[PDB]
């Protein structure tokens, strides 16, 4: 999540108020974190399918780097839970083996 979804509720395709789809795609490309040079290269494209394919490829290219980071985070965190949880079990081994035995 980057921007609010209310703008998406404002300009929906089924309301037919989208008189400028190319601007909607530009508004959606505004959500991209891509470099200004990438925006200019998308602007160099003249055909609609070519700039749409480039804007979608840019959207996915940011989505790849993001997904790699989120996966790496959840991985390290789960490694921490695995770390501590067995210590809790070992801690139980202790607490069941001080006064018992």
């Amino acid at each position: 999540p980057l921007y609010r979804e209310s703008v998406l509720q404002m300009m929906q395709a089924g309301q037919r108020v989208v008189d400028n789809p190319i601007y909607l795609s530009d508004m959606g490309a505004a959500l991209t974190g891509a470099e200004s040079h990438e925006l200019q290269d998308v602007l160099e494209e003249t055909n609609i399918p070519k700039r749409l394919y480039k804007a979608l490829s840019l959207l996915k290219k940011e989505f790849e780097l993001s997904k790699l980071q989120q996966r790496l985070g959840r991985e390290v965190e789960e490694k921490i839970k695995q770390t501590h949880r067995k210590y809790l079990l070992q801690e139980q081994l202790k607490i069941i083996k001080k006064e018992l035995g």
Binding site: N20, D26, M27, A29, A30, S36, L39
Partner: protein, 35 residues
């Protein structure tokens, strides 16, 4: 026929409101010249 604006690291995507705050005060002369 106006001097070029100092974008100064501020992308402005199409149909997307954006604010610009250049550190230079010379653009303020251009804003007053357009008032």
């Amino acid at each position: 026929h106006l001097p070029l604006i100092a974008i100064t690291r501020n992308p402005v995507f199409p149909r997307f409101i954006k604010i610009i705050e250049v550190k230079n005060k010379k653009l303020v002369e251009l804003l007053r010249r357009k008032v």
